[PDB]
Amino acid sequence: LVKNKCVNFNFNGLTGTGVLTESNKKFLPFQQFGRDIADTTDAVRDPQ
């Protein structure tokens, strides 16, 4: 895992590019990743 640096990140098939930062969002056990108003990924949980 890398943080605070642009990367080609992949999470269980969800692919994207950019920086990661500590999340203030409170997910629920069934929830895996988070989307925003514009239907784009905004927060993701480490599967490990």
Partner: peptide, 21 residues
């Protein structure tokens, strides 16, 4: 016998987090 379902039969459509949307 029969009855009325007011607001039952609702579930999370997918394993996706959202907020105030």
């Amino acid at each position: 016998a029969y009855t009325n379902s007011f607001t039952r039969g609702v579930y999370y459509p997918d394993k996706v987090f959202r907020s105030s949307v």
